[PDB]
Structures are given as C-alpha cells and as structure tokens.
Amino acid sequence: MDFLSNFLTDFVGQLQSPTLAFLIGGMVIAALGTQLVIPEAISTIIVFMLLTKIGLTGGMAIRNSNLTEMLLPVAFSVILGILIVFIARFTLAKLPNVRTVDALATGGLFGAVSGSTMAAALTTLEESKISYEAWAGALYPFMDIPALVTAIVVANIYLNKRKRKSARVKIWPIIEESLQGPALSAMLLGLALGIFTKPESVYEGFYDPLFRGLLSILMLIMGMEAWSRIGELRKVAQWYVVYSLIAPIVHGFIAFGLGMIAHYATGFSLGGVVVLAVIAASSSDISGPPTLRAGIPSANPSAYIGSSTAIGTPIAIGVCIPLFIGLAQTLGAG
Amino acid sequence: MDFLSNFLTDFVGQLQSPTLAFLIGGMVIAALGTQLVIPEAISTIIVFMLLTKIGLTGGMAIRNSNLTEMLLPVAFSVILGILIVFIARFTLAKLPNVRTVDALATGGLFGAVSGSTMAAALTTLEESKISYEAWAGALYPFMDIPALVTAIVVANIYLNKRKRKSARVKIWPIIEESLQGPALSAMLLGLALGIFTKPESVYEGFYDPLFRGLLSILMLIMGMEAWSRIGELRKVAQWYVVYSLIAPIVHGFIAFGLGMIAHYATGFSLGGVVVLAVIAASSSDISGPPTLRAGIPSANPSAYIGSSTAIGTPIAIGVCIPLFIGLAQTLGAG
Amino acid sequence: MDFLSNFLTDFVGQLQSPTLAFLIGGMVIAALGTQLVIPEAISTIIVFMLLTKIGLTGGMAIRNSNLTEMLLPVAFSVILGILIVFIARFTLAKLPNVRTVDALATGGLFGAVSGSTMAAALTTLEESKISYEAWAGALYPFMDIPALVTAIVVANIYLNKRKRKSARVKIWPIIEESLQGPALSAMLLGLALGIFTKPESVYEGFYDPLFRGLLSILMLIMGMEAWSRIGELRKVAQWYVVYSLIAPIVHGFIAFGLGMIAHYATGFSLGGVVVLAVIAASSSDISGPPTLRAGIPSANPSAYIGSSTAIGTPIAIGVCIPLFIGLAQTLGAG
Amino acid sequence: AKPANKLVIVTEKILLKKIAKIIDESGAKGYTVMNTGGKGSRNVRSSGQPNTSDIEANIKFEILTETREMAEEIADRVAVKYFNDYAGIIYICSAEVLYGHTFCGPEGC
Amino acid sequence: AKPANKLVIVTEKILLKKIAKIIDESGAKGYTVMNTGGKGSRNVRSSGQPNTSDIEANIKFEILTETREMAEEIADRVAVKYFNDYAGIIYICSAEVLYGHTFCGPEGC
Amino acid sequence: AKPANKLVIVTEKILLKKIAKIIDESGAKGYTVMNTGGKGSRNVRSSGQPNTSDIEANIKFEILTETREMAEEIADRVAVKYFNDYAGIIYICSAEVLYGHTFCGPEGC
Ligand SMILES: Nc1ncnc2c1ncn2[C@@H]1O[C@H](COP(=O)(O)O)[C@@H](O)[C@H]1O
Ligand SMILES: Nc1ncnc2c1ncn2[C@@H]1O[C@H](COP(=O)(O)O)[C@@H](O)[C@H]1O
Ligand SMILES: Nc1ncnc2c1ncn2[C@@H]1O[C@H](COP(=O)(O)O)[C@@H](O)[C@H]1O
Ligand code: NA
Ligand code: NA
Ligand code: NA
C-alpha cells in the first residue's frame, strides 16, 4: 500500500548514492571504450580487506552475544541455497531451447552470494539508519557453499542417467576447495580474529574508514565487468535474459518472508532480514564461476556467467537493495 | 618590483613542501642506483583516484554555479593549446640541426597537460591559502586534446608537401582515442558523478584525505621517470635542452596574462589564473607519448619524451609553480 | 624475580594484539590451503611506505636533537652485527652434520634485521605507552650491512684455505648493492626528507594513520611466507631448528645488556634499548636472502632461508618482543 | 647436445595445477609455464579474477622430453581429459638440450 | 601431427591491437601474445605507463599457420606497415600441431 | 629468411643483469627475456620478494644468433659460471629470421 511510495523515492536515493552511482558510472564509460583498467593486484586487495572488515565486525559481535539467535538465520540460508537451484531445475530448464546442464549452472550461481552485492547492502543499511545485525556478514558461507554443491551433484545425477541409463561426486573436495579460496578465507580469518583476539585498534582506523571508499572502486570494476559480458548472453537463448531479470526479485521475496519467521520465533534484527534478502537475491560472479566449470565442465560458460554478471548483479543492486530496504522500512521500523 | 622578493622566499617554501621534496628526492635516489621500484599496478591506481578527486571536486562546484563564468577560461585554453605547437613550429624548428617532425612533436607535448604537474598546483594553491576556482580541474581536457591534435595535423601537412609536392588526417579518431584513455576517462567519470549524483560521503573520507599522500608517491615516480630519460636527450641536439628549460616560463606568461582578461571580463577567481598558468606550462608525459607515436610515427621519441620528462616536468613544478603563485600573490590577493 | 610475572601476562596481551594475531592467523590459513594470495605489487608498496614512515619519524627527531647521543647505539650495533656471525661460526658450525658455508649464511641473516620484525616492535612500544627514541628506526642500516658483509668475507676466507691451501672479496660492491636496494633506499629517502625538508603535512595524514593497518597486511604475508618454508628446513639437519629457536633469545640478551651501557654513559631512552634488542633478535628473510646467494653461492638456500623465515621471524615477534618489553618494563620505567 | 622434443601446451589458466599433475606423473623431468594471452574462437576464460583485468588469460607449458613417445603420452592424457570441454592447442617442436643436470645426467650432454 | 609454422613477432607493446587486426584479417586461426622485455638498440618504449615500471615493454606474438605462404603474408603486412618506424623482429620456426579444434578440423590431426 | 639459432636460457630470476652482461659481451645483437614459472627439483627461488607472491620465479632468455658457434659460446659462459650453484636449462632451436634490422643488415634477409 505504502510500498510503491517508499520505493520510488528510495530508488532515486539509491541511485544518487555512490554504491550504485559508480556501478552505472562504470557501465557508461565501458560502453564508450575507455582503456582505463583497474589492475588485478588492486582488485585483489579490494576484495580482501572489504571482506576482512565484514569478518571483523561479525566476529566482534558474535563473542559477546548468546549464539542461540543465530540458529534460525543460518539454517534458513542452507535451506534457501539448496532451494534456488531446484527452482531453476523446474522453471528455467523447462523452456524450448535451453539445456538442463546450463540451467542448473545458472541457478547454481544465483543460489551463491557475491561480496560486491552484499557489502553494497551493508553500507546502505547503515546509510538509511537501519540497525542491522552485525554477525549477518558471517552468513556469507552458508548459501554460498550448499548452493554451488547442489548444482554439481544435481547436474551429475542428470548427466549419469542420460548416458548410463538412457544412451559419484565426491561431496567434500567441492566444499573444501570453495572454502579455502580467496574472498572466503579472507572472511573466515576475519571471523576468527574477531572472536578470539581484540583487533579494535586496527579495525577503527584502517578497515572501517576506507571501507566505503574501496567499495566504490570495487563497484566500478563490477560495472565494467558487467558490460564485458553483455555481448555474451546474446550467444545463448533469450530466456536467460528473462531469468536473470526476474529471479533477483523472486528469490528475495522467498528470502524475506522465509526470514520473517525470525523476529517472530527468536529475536532477530529486522534489518537483518533485508540483509538475508539481498544475500539471497545476489548471484556470485568472482568466486562462483571457478567452480561450476571444474565441477560442471559440460556446461556453457557463456550462459551462466553472462547472466549473473551482466544482468544479475546490476539488478540485485539497482532495483533490489532499495526494493527490500523500503519494504522493511514500511513493514516495521527503519 | 616586489616579485623577486616574493619568489625567492616562495621557491624555498616550495622546496620544503613534499610536493616538490619527493620529486628531487626521487631524482637523487635514482641517480644513485636504487633497485626500488613502484610497480605498475600501484602507479595506475594513483593516477586514477587522484584525477577522480579532481573530477569530483570539479563536478560538485559546477552544478550549483552559473556556467557563464566558464566561457572565457575554457575558450582561452583551446586557443592556447593550439598556440603552443605553432610557437614550436616557428621558434624551435628553425635551428640548424633539428627536424621539423620532432619539433612539432616536442611542442605537441608542451601544449598538453599532465595531471602530475597539475595536482601539484592544486595542493599548493590551497597550502598557501589562495582560494582557487574548483571547476578549474575540469579544464584539463581542453589544452590537452586540441594541442595533441594540432601537432599531428600540422606534422602531416608538412610531411605531405615534402614527398607529394617537393620530392588526410581523420580528425575524430585522434580525439576519441585520447578522450577514452586512462587518466582522462577517470576524470570525466569524476565530473559526471559530481554533476548528477551526490558522492559527498565518499569524497570526504576516501578521495580527499589520501589525495596529498598519494600525490607524494606519484611525485616520487615522476622524479625517477625523469632521471631515466635524462640520458636520452643527450642523443638529440642541444637545442632541446634550451627549449624545455625556457618554454615552461614562456608558455605560462602568455597563459597568465591571456587569463588576466578573465576577472576583468567575467568574474574569475585569480587563484584560477595561476591554475590556468601551471596547466599551460606543464608538459604531458604519461598520456601524451602514446599519441604522437601512433599519430606521428616518423618522429624521434628520444627528442620529445626526453624533453618533457627530464627537463619539462621538474621545471614546471620546481621553478614554475612558485613563479606564478607569488606573481599572483603580488598582483592582487593571495 | 618479577619477570616471569610480567611476561606471561604480556605474552597473552601480545597475542591478542593484531601485530601478532595476523601472523599466527596467517600461518593457520596457509596450513589449511587458501588460494588467497596478496600480490607482489601490494607487498612492495607495503614494505615501502612503512619504512618511509620509520624514516620520516626518524629524520624529524634527528635534526632538532644533538647527535652526540647517537654515538653509542650506532656503534653498539656495528659491533653486534659482526658479533652474531662469529657466534654462528663457533657455535652452529661445530655440530656433526652441518656445513660451515651454510652456518655462516644462517648467522649472516640473524645478524641482519627485518623491517617487518622491527615495525612490529615500534607499534608495540607505543601501544604499551613506553616512550622510545624516535631516531632508533634509523638504526636499521647498521647491523644489516656489517652483518651480511662479515658473512661473505668470512665464508670466502674459509673457502679459500680449503682449495688453495688444503686441497679477495671486493668489500664495497657488497655494501653499495645492499644499500641501494629496496626497503633500505625507501628509508634513507625517508631520513633525508625528514632532516632537510618539512613533510609534516603528509606524515600526519598519510604515513602515520595507515601504518598500523598496513603492518597487519604485512604481518599476514610473513605468516604465509613462514609456512611456505616450514617444509624446507626438514631437508637440512635438525640443528637448524635448535639454532633458529634459541638464537633470537640469546642475541637479544647480549643486545639488551650491551645496550644497557647506554643511558648509563650518554642519555638513552630505555625504550630504545628494547628497540635495539628486537632489531638484534630479528632476521632478514626479504633483503638478506638476495645477498648471501650472489655473495655465497656455494651455500644451501634451504638451510638459511628455512631458518630465518619459518622459525626465526615468528619467534622474534611471538616470544621475543614481549620478552624484552616486559624486561624493560620490570627493570625501570614503562 | 642431447636431442629433445619441446612439447608446448597452450590452454586456459584454470588448468594450472591439473596439467602440472599430468606432467609430473608422466615421468618428465620438469616443465616451464608462463601466463599468455590469446584468441582462438573459444574465448570465455572464467579465470577467477574479473574479466577486464585479464591482459593474460592463458597458460603455456613447455616440456622438454627425451623421447617422442613420452611427449605424445603427455599430450594424449590432456586432450582426452580436458580439451573436449576446455580450450587448448598442443604442438611439438625440436630442440637439442645443451646443458642441464636432470636432463643430461651426471655425464653431461 | 599436422605440420605447421610458428610465426613469432616480437615488437613494441603499443602495437597490441594493431597487429592483432592484421592477424585476424589474414585468415589465421588465432594468436598467442605475451608481455616480454628486451634489448635491441632501438630501445625507447613509450608504452603508456611510466618508464621505471616497464619490467616488460615488448609483446611477443606466436601464430601457428597451416601453410608457409600465410606466415610470410602476415609477416610482410607488419614489416612494411610498422617496422620502418617501430621496433621489431620476425622469425619462423617449425612445429607439428598435435591437438586443437580450429587448426585440425573435426577429423583431427 | 636468414637461418638463425634460437638459444633459450631458463634460469632463476636473480640472474637477470648477470646473464644479460654475458649476452652483451658475446656479440649477440640482442635478447628477449620474460618472467616464467617452473618446476625442476632445484626449487628454492630467493628472488627478493616474499615466496607466496612468486607466481613467476624464473626468467627465460631467447637469443637469436647468426652462427651456431656463438650460441654455444653464450651457453658455455653461463653453465660454467652459474649452473654449478644455480638452477637452469639451456637448449638450441632452429629459426629463419625474416625481418629485423640489426640481424639482417641494411640489405635485408
Ligand atoms: N593457430 C594458432 N596459433 C597460435 N595459438 C593458437 C592457435 N590456435 C589457438 N591458439 C591458442 O590456443 C588457445 C586456445 O584456443 P582455442 O582452443 O582454439 O580457442 C589460445 O591461447 C589461443 O591463442
Ligand atoms: N637477435 C635477437 N634475438 C632475440 N630478440 C631480439 C633480437 N634482436 C632484437 N630482438 C628483440 O626485438 C625487439 C626489437 O628490437 P630492435 O627492433 O632490434 O630494437 C626487442 O624486444 C628485442 O629484444
Ligand atoms: N625438462 C624440462 N622442460 C622444461 N623446463 C625445464 C625442464 N627441466 C628444467 N626446466 C626448467 O629449468 C628451470 C630450472 O630447473 P632445474 O635447474 O632443473 O631445477 C626451471 O624453470 C624449470 O622449469
Ligand atoms: Na543467491
Ligand atoms: Na602545456
Ligand atoms: Na639481527
């Protein structure tokens, strides 16, 4: 009722803010040429030390708090990450010209989460003065690991009964290879240094001040990395453009209400529900497509990378972070 | 009259300040060996995000101001950038052992503007408490683009009538290749994000605090990049040492007084006149010599790079930024 | 007497602090895999601009002070750096299965210092509110250069009388190659810019704020670079594990008391004695290696690198920086 | 000058550890890998980092084998296992190894 | 093992897109470029970035062509067009392409 | 197509200036060096920077010499002087230099 009112004045205020302004600013210059490039050594130390901040601010507010409250949101993400790939197995794969191996790999990437679309939400939640739960940054590995592993298993149980029955996946080295990769071992280090040590002299002074600044450099990369794959999903069928444009809206609604069971059962933050939504509505595109290419080699990389970079991440930040902040700002306090 | 008084006490105070102290500090260590090197990934993110600050502080103070005042200084730079290459065509090229193709390419770089000699002036103008005009950083593309394009056209109209008449330049892909290059598309992004969006939470906090710090790393590179070409203009004739040592003084005097027409015609800042001088006296050496090597391939790169790096940029910062601050501090307010 | 009391409560408070927490945090993740890597372009600009801060804060407090006080500590380090390699020549080399060429090269690195193990002491001295002498950072050159040069000379005077007598070192290009290397010409630049210029607007604002933050990134590299060589000293004999685990304790005791002659003879800081102990108990592992491989090519690099990275630097920071802060906090003021 | 065969494998970057296992298990004395860029009409290159900073996105192995039948044993366990789904090209050149210890032996070449 | 010719072009870095147009227009199936450093008595190397961070300042193409007459067609449209004003060297080696799809065809090598 | 010999030296990174002195003193017209990574059972690689950021830790020279006896003169002054204590491998391939000025001469190839 009051929701279209507090979206359209919130979509504009999102678009004025530098966490989206540099994303569409990065797509505009990359559409015009621009031999400007941010080098790989800078992009690595910006994905690190942005997830170390998310880890340190999650580890500090997880040792002085009773960890009974965490039981519902870390179980509502394991369920939800497995749920996304089965939605793509019964909705996306059942179109006329689309392969099942690609549609499981596209839904595998949307099931995961990306730290770019996530850290864009953690600033915007505390820019609009909504007190979110601080350990919700530590909810990143859940619904990243069970979503990529239930796209490799399901694609093999499809591909076995096509050549063995019609014409075995080791479950641990999938999840002990994605766990000790970059951008996740940066945060698990940041968690364990917050639970056990006291890094409060280096958090406030290095990791917290240049967090919103380095996020803007990182949002500029993701805009240029979105235009570089916009000509790649014009190689596969037209239903991926429909999926990647609607599935951030659908996966977050069945993340919001599935996370509205919290703060009705155990005391949850209600600014953590919108964090749990933006993490469900965002698709992985840095740590994701290394897997689902060693795990699902028979898939088309132009079909799942071109959907989660070009259309998945700008819509998860443009029309989805203000879609769930305002809906949480309407339904309750903000 | 009072000008030699307020130069010699201003040249020393320039030389104590870190925006020149690291330049001569960078030449001293590079003269002594020093396998110290600042890598290319760090030098790229320092030329970016120093020109993004110049863009953001120019774009913020261009939307809340009537843009009638800009008409004289952005036309006095297009005239002046074309003027520099014709001065080198009738003064530098008319020496006994010098080629016309090289002298047009040497004057092509001095017409252009480098962001190193420019951002060194924008700090020193607000270190000596002289209120400069904030959009004068957006005057960078003018007198960078018409100066490089009127050195490629004039060198071809010389080289045509030497083999066709004695023994055609496509004007747009010269200026749509220098425009979407790095260090200029970094600033045009910074302009458009200042006019249209509101990046005031990331400007004060990331781009403004570590501006004067990253400038000192960048001045250290330019000192080491000046000693690496000091043995290169000992390969061409001795008149390039005379040109590159006098032309920053001459090109700025006919930039100061040509910009003294402003704040007599339309209200201009008088701390923007010295910004318009240091931009006219400075010579490009990062974005410049990619062009005038694809545009003028028959020139000697040892003749125009060795003059604008080794002698052009240390003199444009050492004896030229305090030469025009004090002259603006004498003639009027400071 | 009161020393085991003020060690065990100081070893824990060291281990909570991020200058050791990221070191053991870096070894734990590297023991578990972690394709996380900090790139070489970031590691170079962190070793630079951490030693520029040590240089600038040493150069500022060396021009307004009478430099008679410096005569004893800069002579007590030249004596001590030559002393370490002779201790390894008469203690480490006289074991059953150990080569003299390797034992001189292992003691050559322990003689030298390490900016990473020294930057960790300069924060912890001003974290526990102990007023250390500011020019003691300028003590890095001494006991780095005479320790590496008295391991190359002594190894050649051993290796000459084995093939010429049984079966010449140019002394200047050893010390004019280590002097104009990186991580030392970064600090000598920082000294000369502090003595002569006034970089107080760029020191407080760029080099001092993100000093303790970049140190934590650098301590994370040194932990991962310690686990990468922990499987390398299992290739040489077991007495290197004994040497590298005891020699940081022994070399600092005969640095503390040898530096206790100061502030009894000339007025020294007593927080500079613990700085002179840690600079003496640390090893090279970054600059030392390049030398003692061009200088002593017949040595085993698995024997001296594997001792000063894997066991030398974690013990010099874990059990040696709180060992000498508390001993200086017991014996006198803290 | 012991005559050898330079096997060259030019594939995607994400097969760095996987083909280096195939080289080590085949009995070759070693390899030499470097990061290259290319163009071959199968150009996608996931690679782990973002796309715009992929100046080099391939890897190029160079394996010097003593016999021809080992170089086609390495090249066959790669093209069967990876090149049906990944990018790549394999070719053999000729070379005479002058110096080296693991390839000559203690007697020399 | 389809016999091929490895054309190698080692030129300045600023000719990255320009020679890659010549390779694509000539009908070669692809190229492999990498960043190298060198020394050839024409050493200036503008290159876009500052000079001291030019550890590598050249580029090295490697084009495998099916016939000799295509490799000297690529090499001739470069040396006429660029090597009168730019640095460079071109040489042909010999190779036998074992695997690959665009170079063998669907029948294989 | 002037017939040449491609001498390739693949050694540790810290011998960058030292072998480049040997190449310049031998009378070769130039070299081409690039940073590679490898595996050869003498893998320590001090290299100056820390170990974990040593994605590439070797260097690879490629020297085109006019005569065979110069290429084995360069290769002999390296293996005697450095390969008794350092890592390395040297091999000669064959090549026909098509273009270039310092290698052909003004008359061309
Ligand atoms: N004819 C060729 N010459 C040189 N390199 C090639 C050739 N064909 C393919 N490549 C390289 O092989 C890799 C894979 O190409 P492709 O598998 O054909 O897409 C890329 O690095 C290409 O540059
Ligand atoms: N004889 C040679 N062997 C190997 N590389 C060479 C040779 N001559 C020139 N080059 C390379 O060719 C490029 C241009 O050299 P030049 O055009 O001779 O200045 C540089 O990358 C050199 O390293
Ligand atoms: N058989 C081989 N093929 C290719 N490269 C090799 C071979 N043997 C050694 N290398 C390279 O030679 C260098 C030194 O190896 P080594 O001296 O054998 O430890 C390393 O860069 C290795 O990758
Ligand atoms: Na998701
Ligand atoms: Na100019
Ligand atoms: Na020491």
For residue A322, give the CATH number of its domain: 1.20.1530
Which residue in B30, B53, B105, B118 sits closest to B310, CA to CA?
B30
List the single residue in A with minimal CA-CA distance to C214. A206
A213 touches chain B (CB under 8 A): yes
With CA atoms as reference, report the closest residue to A252 among A58, A110, A108. Answer: A110
Asked if residues A315 and A246 have their Cβ atoms less than 8 Å apart, the reply is no
Beta strand E2-12 pairing with D31-39: unpaired
Answer whether D32 contacts ligand 3 (Cβ < 6 A).
yes
Please, which experimental method was used? cryo-EM
A47-59 in b/e burial notation, b at 16+ Cβ within 10 A? bbbbbbbbbbbbb
Using only C-alpha atoms, what is the Rg of chain A? 19
- Comparing C-alpha atoms, which of A203, A41, A214 is closest to residue A120? A214
Rounded CA gap, C307 and C284, in Å? 10
| Tokens found for residue B76 | 């006095």
Q: How far apart are CA B37 and CA B224, in angstroms?
A: 9
Rounded to an integer, what distance in angstroms lies between the CA atom of residue B255 and that of residue B81? 10
d(CA A130, CA A82): 29
Cβ pair C219, C22 in contact under 8 A: yes
Residue A44 has phi, psi (to 5 degrees) of -80, -45
In sequence order, which residues have a C-beta less than 8 Å from that of residue B220 and are 6 or more positions away? B22, B23, B25, B26, B38
- φ, ψ at D96 (rounded to 5°): -115, 110
C-alpha–C-alpha distance, residues A112 and A183, integer Å? 13
CA gap F78, F73 in Å, rounded: 9
Pairing of strands F31-39, E31-39: antiparallel
Q: For residue A144, which of A173, A172, A183, A87 has the smallest C-alpha distance?
A: A183
- Domain residues for the domain of B177 are 5-329
User: Is residue C305 in some structural domain?
Assistant: yes
* Gaps in chain C with C–N over 2.5 Å, residue before each: 167
| Tokens of residue A264, six digits | 């009705």
Residue A17's CB is within 10 A of a number of other CB atoms, namely 23
- Asked if C49 lies within 8 A of B217 by C-beta distance, the reply is yes
Q: Which tokens is D19 given?
A: 């083909």
Query: Which ligand is closest in space to the CA of residue D66?
Result: 3
Q: Residue F35 forms beta bridges with which residues?
A: F59
Structure tokens at B74: 């952005």
- Name the strand (E) or helix (H) holding D2: strand D2-12
The token pair at A122 is: 């953690």
If you ran DSSP here, which 8-state letter would residue C207 be given?
I
Q: Residue C25: inside a domain, yes or no?
A: no
Dig out the tokens for C74 from the structure.
Answer: 């800069």
* Residue of B23, B29, B40, B148 best to disrupt the E interface, most CBs of E under 10 A: B40
For chain B, the first-to-last Cα distance in angstroms comes to 17
Query: Does residue B158 lie within any of the structural domains?
Result: yes
Distance CA B231, CA A236 (A): 56
CA E1 to each of CA B122, B156, E96: distance values in angstroms, whole numbers, following the listed order: 64, 50, 5
> At A316, which amino acid appears?
A
Cβ distance A304 to A85 under 8 Å?
no
- Which DSSP category does E40 fall into? -
Which tokens hold the place of F77?
Answer: 């002054």
Q: Which residues pair with E62 in a beta bridge?
A: E8, E32
In Å, how far are B6, B148, E87 from E91, measured between CA atoms? 63, 36, 14
Taking CB atoms and an 8 Å limit, are E35 and F31 in contact across chains? no
Question: Of B105, B150, B126, which Cα lies nearest the Cα of B293?
Answer: B105
Is B103 a domain residue? yes
| Pocket lining: D30 vs ligand 3, CB cutoff 6 Å | yes
Asked if the Cβ–Cβ distance from C232 to F44 is below 8 Å, we say yes
SS3 E8: strand
Length of chain D: 109
- Measure CA C35 to chain center: 28
Is residue C274 within a helix (H) or strand (E), and if so which, with residue range?
A: helix C273-281
Resolution given for this structure, in angstroms: 3.2
**3 state DSSP class of E58:** strand
Let me know: does C304 contact C102? Beta carbons within 8 Å: yes
- Asked if residues E49 and E35 have their Cβ atoms less than 8 Å apart, the reply is no
Give the distance (Å) from ligand 6 centre to CA of residue B243.
Answer: 52
Under 8 Å between Cβ of D6 and D62? yes
Contact B267, B250 (CB under 8 A): no
Residue type, B196: F
Protein residues near ligand 6, an ion, with CB under 5 A: C 280
- Residue B253's nearest CA partner among B317, B324, B190 is B324
Residues making up chain C, counted from first to last: 334
Is ligand 1 within 6 A of the CB of residue E62? yes
From chain A residues 22-51, the ones with a CB under 8 A of any chain B CB are 22, 25-26, 28-29, 32-42
Which amino acid, B324?
F
Beta bridge partners of D10: D60, D89
**Cβ atoms of C144 and C175 closer than 8 Å:** no
Atom of ligand 1 nearest to the CA of D86: 17
Spatial separation of the C-alpha atoms in residues F60 and F11, rounded to whole Å: 7
In total, chain F counts a number of residues equal to: 109
Angle between helices A18-31 and A115-125 (to 10 degrees): 140
Number of C-alpha atoms within 13 angstroms, CB side, residue B193?
34
Q: How far apart are CA B64 and CA A297, in angstroms?
A: 55
Contact E66 CB / ligand 1 (< 6 Å): no
User: In this structure, what is the dihedral angle of CA atoms F95, F100, F101, F104, given to the nearest 10 degrees?
Assistant: 30
Tell me how far apart the 2 most distant CA atoms of chain F are, in Å. 50
The three-class DSSP label of residue F34 is strand
The CA distance from B150 to B173, in Å, is: 13
Residue B226's H or E segment, with its range, is helix B212-227
Which residues of chain D have a CB within 8 Å of the CB of A290? 14, 46-48
Give the 3-state secondary structure of residue C61. Answer: coil
Strands E88-99 and E31-39, bridge-based pairing? unpaired
Mutate to test the interface with F, among E61, E73, E91, E93 (most CBs of F within 10 A): E91
DSSP assignment, residue B11?
Answer: H
Mutate to test the pocket of ligand 2, among F32, F66, F94 (most ligand atoms within 8 A of CB): F32
Do A305 and A164 form a contact (C-beta atoms < 8 A)? no
Burial track C134-173 (b if 16+ CB lie within 10 A, e otherwise): bbbbbbbbbbbbbbbbbbbbbbbeeeeeeeeeeeeeeeee
d(Cα C329, Cα C332) in Å, to the nearest integer? 6
Looking at the 3D structure of chain C, how many domains does it have? 1
Q: Which amino acid would we find at residue B201?
A: S
Q: CA-CA-CA-CA torsion for A44, A45, A48, A53, nearest 10 degrees?
A: -150
Neighbours of C (≥3 Cβ pairs closer than 8 A)? Answer: A, B, F
Answer whether A29 sits within 8 Å of B198, measured CB to CB. no
Q: How far apart are CA A29 and CA B40, in angstroms?
A: 22
- The residue assigned the tokens 């977050």 is A252
CA distances from A172 to A101, A179, A234, A299, C30 (A): 21, 10, 35, 22, 19
Distance (Å, whole) CA C297 – CA C294: 6
**What amino acid is encoded at A237 in this protein?**
A
Question: Cα–Cα distance between A198 and A194 in angstroms, integer?
Answer: 6
State which amino acid sits at residue A120.
A
Output the six-digit token pair for C217: 């990134």
Judge whether B334 lies within some domain: no
Q: φ, ψ for residue E36 (rounded to 5)?
A: -120, 170
The tally of CA atoms less than 13 A away on the side-chain side of residue D77 is: 15
- CB neighbours of residue B32 within 10 Å: 13
Q: Rounded to the nearest 5°, which phi and psi values hold at A229?
A: -110, 5
Give the type of residue at B33: G
